[PDB]
Design a protein around this ligand. Sequence first.
Ligand SMILES: Nc1ncnc2c1ncn2[C@@H]1O[C@H](COP(=O)(O)OP(=O)(O)OP(=O)(O)O)[C@@H](O)[C@H]1O
Ligand SMILES: [Mg+2]
Ligand SMILES: [Mg+2]
Lengths: 19, 350
Amino acid sequence: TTYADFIASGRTGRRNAIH
Amino acid sequence: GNAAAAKKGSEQESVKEFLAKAKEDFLKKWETPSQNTAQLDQFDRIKTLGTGSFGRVMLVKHKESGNHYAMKILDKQKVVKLKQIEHTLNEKRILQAVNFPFLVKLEFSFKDNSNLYMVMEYVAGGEMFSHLRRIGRFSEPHARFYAAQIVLTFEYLHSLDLIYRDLKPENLLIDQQGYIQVTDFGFAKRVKGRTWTLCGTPEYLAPAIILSKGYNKAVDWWALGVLIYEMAAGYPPFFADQPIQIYEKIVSGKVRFPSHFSSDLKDLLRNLLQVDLTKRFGNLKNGVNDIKNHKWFATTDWIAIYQRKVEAPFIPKFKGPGDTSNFDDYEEEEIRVSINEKCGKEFTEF
Ligand SMILES: Nc1ncnc2c1ncn2[C@@H]1O[C@H](COP(=O)(O)OP(=O)(O)OP(=O)(O)O)[C@@H](O)[C@H]1O
Ligand SMILES: [Mg+2]
Ligand SMILES: [Mg+2]
């Protein structure tokens, strides 16, 4: 499932801004 | 029927006047910003509520009052190194001039030899982010309740010629009434027309920002599209392990929706996640009204939302003042202050 793929990815934690 | 038409037609004349008085108030502060309204020693530093790629926000208690506040600390030297000088000046100058129910209030601000400080009202409910990840996803009515508040906030901000540029669950907080408090004005900018800076957060960047093209306020509406999608699905419309991978997906023009998304939700999102900014909702002849009148928001009483008269779908637990249980824990660090003034000229107006 898409949700399972997301949960298994590297960016499920707090996301910081880029510049 | 003819009754709703009158209700909608009348309310618009009202918000028109509201926005008018709002601009006057804003302009006054924008032209003459408050400065040096407190000092570090008047507060006791309690605990870190969160950190960003720029600063550290700590819970603090005001000594001569006992009141708690959220203090954002920025290392002047780091700001310069990350080329965030003008952005930082924008951040404080704008934050101290705005006034809206869903915008965090800047109580005080000041600086010393090493750091810049922005003392905000402490929003104890925690980030929308943590609740969203914990719960998984919000029901459409739950997501709508928050969305409605973002819509009104952007209407406000945009009318003052302000572009927000960093909408995300991490920058949205829940107060004790279950309502939203937008924080982090780090990329906020007062601008009429296009601007070009590459800034924001990967998953929320509009295509224009990614393609190094000039862009306008429409990027905030695109970000709203991403927010609603993430809130309702539990994950972003465009995700991957590396930013570049996310970017290729964002500019592709392809978005897939979860089977449980309503027809109204999908339609609204297809209009917000519109790569062609000339066709994007919020950026058309009728502007924000195309969004407020959209079917997905049919049950939304906009005036009631503004007055905070709508029962929030969720109210965080609050065990009294100073309670930081709704926030993750972070590693602490002493707030160093050099005996030597750093980057004085750069931050003169702060
Ligand atoms: N008024 C507040 N009350 C409570 N917590 C707050 C408040 N303001 C900020 N925070 C918390 O502190 C965190 C960091 O603040 P902020 O987002 O402004 O840092 P930042 O460096 O600008 O992060 P970013 O990487 O998004 O640029 C927020 O994500 C939030 O968890
Ligand atoms: Mg932030
Ligand atoms: Mg920021």
